[PDB]
């Protein structure tokens, strides 16, 4: 942290976060949503970081080159160490990216490795190649030089993302699934785990051993597991919580705006939320079906009249102010909802449903008090638009993300916010071999227009393949787009250091602080 001159600090520097949920895992390997990054920011580091405003900054690796875009060359600081005292090397990042790659780890972010096109993935992936002949190699114990396929020069923004932070191996091979256990884990991020009680909290504290640790101020941070929205803002106002997480709830939110505006943080994020359509399950697997579905739902109710926090409509996957974006705002966005609400009717009589035998499915959702709102909003939209039934059913985070995976669903709410900020954060989780794809869709020809953006050295003709990308996912509806989301939270007035201005919102701790209050 930078502790501006002449700010008093807090006697006890400690800090309550709410974290939405209870997190999947504390291992880098077996993580995919926010909750779940935002531990791991603070117990495992990585090559790079994003510094208190994003930008993409030194982790363990020091400096950088690359040849061609192709071969990167990162140099690893001497005293980069773990909790226990021992070096960080540059075997560790060896051994971190084949364990994340290697099919028996069965990670939800394997395909990352295939985002940035290390070499040899797409075989290790499929069984083909064993692990050990991915494309990296430690040049001497400082020093990881990473070999892609082609050139990627992006290729250092994915490197703050929590999967290819590096793990232990000492501690993976001697304990397994009970590695990340307080008595067993070993971390070279700024915290430590002190506790970890399922459903109840997890608490981290200050890694003397961590290289940057004279700058650290935070001595311990508590994250809790509240998916209730209205219960995590009454735990913030009744001076339990320091920051809230970010999902507002629908019947507090105006009010607070009103009456402690100070705290009421809202900024540009580069998430959106929409419905996650099954594409492989019948009668899901009907463009007809999912198209209804897309046009029915009522963006201008849901986002201005329902939740009203400053969403906007959306109608793409990938934010259109992400970085790179250049998107074409399709002709039904413009129609009025009465003709987007005709033709989806026209497409669903056309599908075979009548009054007599109407379409009925699920809506998952990860337990919470806004989703639940929302859905049920949704549910009497297309209920009136267009004449179906929806039956609501909740899970709790971890199991949710499960089910999406395994494709034992209908329709889900769905939330992505981008790892690194250029399109192909979100486009690469649609490709067909996707291990992000819960979607489960697949089309070769948003496939092949993905492939062509490394092969253009051109930005322009980069950015108008993506903007034809996001073109056939509308044109398939993959998804229904619901709206692109503000990051909106309560943040207590003595917590410094959190600007706001990260669109990727990547709080590491470590640069926090108490002010004496």
């Given at each position: 942290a930078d502790v501006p001159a002449g700010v008093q600090l807090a006697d006890k520097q400690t800090l309550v976060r709410n974290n939405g949920s209870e997190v999947q895992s504390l291992d880098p390997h077996k993580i995919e949503g926010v909750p779940e990054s935002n531990v791991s920011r603070d117990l495992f580091e990585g090559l790079l970081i994003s510094d208190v405003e994003g930008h993409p900054s030194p982790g363990v690796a020091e400096k950088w080159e690359n040849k061609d875009f192709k071969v990167w060359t990162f140099h690893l600081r001497e005293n980069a160490k773990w909790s226990d005292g021992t070096p960080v090397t540059a075997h560790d990042f060896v051994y971190s990216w084949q364990r994340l790659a290697d099919?028996?780890?069965?990670?939800?972010?394997?395909s990352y490795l295939q985002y940035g096109h290390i070499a040899n993935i797409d075989d290790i992936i499929a069984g083909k190649k064993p692990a050990t002949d991915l494309g990296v190699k430690a040049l001497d114990d400082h020093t990881f030089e990473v070999t892609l396929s082609e050139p990627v020069p992006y290729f250092y923004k994915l490197l703050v993302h929590p999967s290819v932070s590096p793990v232990p191996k000492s501690a993976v091979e001697k304990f397994?699934?009970?590695?990340?256990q307080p008595a067993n884990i070993v971390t070279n991020g700024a915290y430590k785990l002190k506790n970890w009680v399922v459903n109840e909290r997890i608490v981290l504290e200050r890694n003397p051993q961590y290289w940057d640790n004279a700058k650290t101020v935070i001595n311990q941070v508590t994250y809790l597991p509240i998916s209730s929205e209205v219960t995590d803002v009454n735990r913030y106002r009744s001076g339990e919580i320091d920051m809230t997480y970010n999902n507002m709830p629908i019947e507090l939110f105006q009010k607070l705006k009103k009456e402690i505006p100070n705290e009421v943080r809202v900024d540009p994020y580069l998430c959106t939320y929409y419905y996650e359509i099954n594409n492989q399950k019948a009668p899901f697997n009907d463009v007809r079906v999912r198209t209804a579905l897309k046009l029915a739902l009522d963006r201008d109710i849901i986002v201005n009249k329902v939740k009203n926090q400053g969403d906007l409509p959306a109608y793409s996957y990938t934010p259109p102010y992400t970085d790179g974006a250049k998107l074409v705002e399709p002709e039904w966005f413009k129609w009025s909802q009465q003709k987007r609400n005709e033709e989806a009717k026209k497409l669903l009589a056309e599908a075979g449903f009548t009054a007599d035998k109407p379409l009925t499915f699920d809506l998952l959702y990860n337990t919470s008090d806004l989703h639940k709102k929302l859905a049920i909003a949704v549910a009497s939209i297309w209920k009136k638009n267009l004449g179906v039934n929806v039956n609501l059913e909740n899970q709790e985070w971890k199991t949710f993300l499960d089910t999406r995976h395994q494709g034992t669903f209908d329709v889900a709410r769905a939330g992505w916010c981008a790892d690194y900020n250029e399109p192909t954060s979100f486009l690469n989780t649609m490709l067909s071999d996707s291990s992000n794809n819960t979607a489960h869709y697949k089309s070769p020809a948003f496939d092949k227009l993905i492939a062509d953006t490394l092969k253009v050295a051109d930005d322009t003709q980069r950015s108008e393949l993506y903007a034809k990308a996001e073109q056939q996912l509308d044109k398939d509806s993959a998804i229904v787009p619901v709206y692109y989301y503000v990051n909106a939270r309560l943040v207590k007035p003595?917590?410094?250091?959190?600007?706001?201005?990260?669109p990727l919102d990547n709080i590491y701790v470590k640069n926090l602080y108490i002010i004496k209050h």
């Open positions: 099919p028996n780890t069965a990670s939800p972010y394997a397994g699934d009970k590695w990340t003595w917590v410094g250091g959190y600007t706001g201005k990260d």
